[PDB]
Amino acid sequence: MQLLTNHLGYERLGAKQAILQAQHHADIICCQSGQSIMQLPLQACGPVAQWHIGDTYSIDFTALNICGDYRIRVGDTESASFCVAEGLLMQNTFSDVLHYFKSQRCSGIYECADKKVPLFGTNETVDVHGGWYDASGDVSKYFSHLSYGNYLNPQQTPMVVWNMLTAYEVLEDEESIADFTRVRLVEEALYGADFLLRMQHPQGYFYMTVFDKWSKSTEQREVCAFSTQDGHKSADYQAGFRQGAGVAIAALAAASRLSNLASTSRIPQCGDIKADTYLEAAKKGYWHLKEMNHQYLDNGKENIIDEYCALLASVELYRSTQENNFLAEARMWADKLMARQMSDHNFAHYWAANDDGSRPYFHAAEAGLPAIALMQYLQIETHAQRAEQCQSVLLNALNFELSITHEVNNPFGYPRQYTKAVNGDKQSAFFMPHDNETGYWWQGENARIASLITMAYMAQNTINDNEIKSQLMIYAHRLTDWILGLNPFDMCMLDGHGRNNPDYLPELGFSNAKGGVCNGITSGFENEQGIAFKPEKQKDDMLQNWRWGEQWIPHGAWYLLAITMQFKERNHV
Q: Which residues bind its own copies (CB under 8 A)?
A: 91, 95-96, 99-100, 102-103, 105, 107-110, 112-113, 176-184, 187, 190-191, 216-219, 267-271, 496, 506-511, 513-515
184 binds, among Na ion, its own copies, none (CB under 5 to 8 A by kind): its own copies
Nearer to its own copies, 220 or 529 (CB): 220
236 binds, among its own copies, Na ion, none (CB under 5 to 8 A by kind): Na ion
Answer yes or no whether residue 296 interacts with Na ion by CB under 5 A.
yes
Three-state secondary structure of 339-371: CCEECCCCCCCEEECCCCCCCECCCCCCCCHHH
- Exactly one of 27, 114, 212, 236 binds Na ion (CB under 5 A); which one? 236
Q: Which of 183, 344, 353, 333 is nearest to 269 (CA)?
A: 183
User: Closest distance between its own copies and the C-beta of residue 137, in Å?
Assistant: 9
User: Closest distance between its own copies and the C-beta of residue 105, in Å?
Assistant: 7
Q: By CB under 5 A, how many residues form the interface with Na ion?
A: 3
Pairing, β 125-126 against β 117-118: antiparallel
Answer yes or no whether residue 302 interacts with Na ion by CB under 5 A.
no
Nearest residue by C-beta to Na ion?
Answer: 296
CA distance linking residue 201 with residue 364, whole number of Å: 29
Which stretches within 411-539 are classed as H helix? Answer: 446-458, 466-483
Return all residues near 217 (Cβ < 8 A) that are at least 6 apart. Answer: none
86 binds, among its own copies, Na ion, none (CB under 5 to 8 A by kind): none
296 binds, among Na ion, its own copies, none (CB under 5 to 8 A by kind): Na ion
Q: Which amino acid is at 116?
A: K
User: Closest distance between Na ion and the C-beta of residue 243, in Å?
Assistant: 5
User: Closest distance between its own copies and the C-beta of residue 571, in Å?
Assistant: 18
Q: Which amino acid is at 263?
A: S
Which range, of 187-195, 295-303, 409-417, 542-550, touches Na ion by CB under 5 A? Answer: 295-303
Nearer to its own copies, 26 or 113 (CB): 113
Cα 342 off chain centre by: 24
User: Closest distance between its own copies and the C-beta of residue 245, in Å?
Assistant: 26
Nearer to its own copies, 183 or 235 (CB): 183
Number of C-beta neighbours around residue 552 at 10 A: 26
User: Closest distance between its own copies and the C-beta of residue 94, in Å?
Assistant: 9
Helix then strand then coil, in percent of the chain rounded to 5, is 40, 15, 45
User: Closest distance between Na ion and the C-beta of residue 283, in Å?
Assistant: 21
Nearer to its own copies, 34 or 202 (CB): 34
> What number of CA atoms fall less than 13 Å from residue 498's CA on the CB side?
30
Pairing, β 232-234 against β 222-227: antiparallel
Note whether 520 and 556 are within 8 A (CB). no
Binding site for Na ion (CB under 5 A): 236, 238, 296
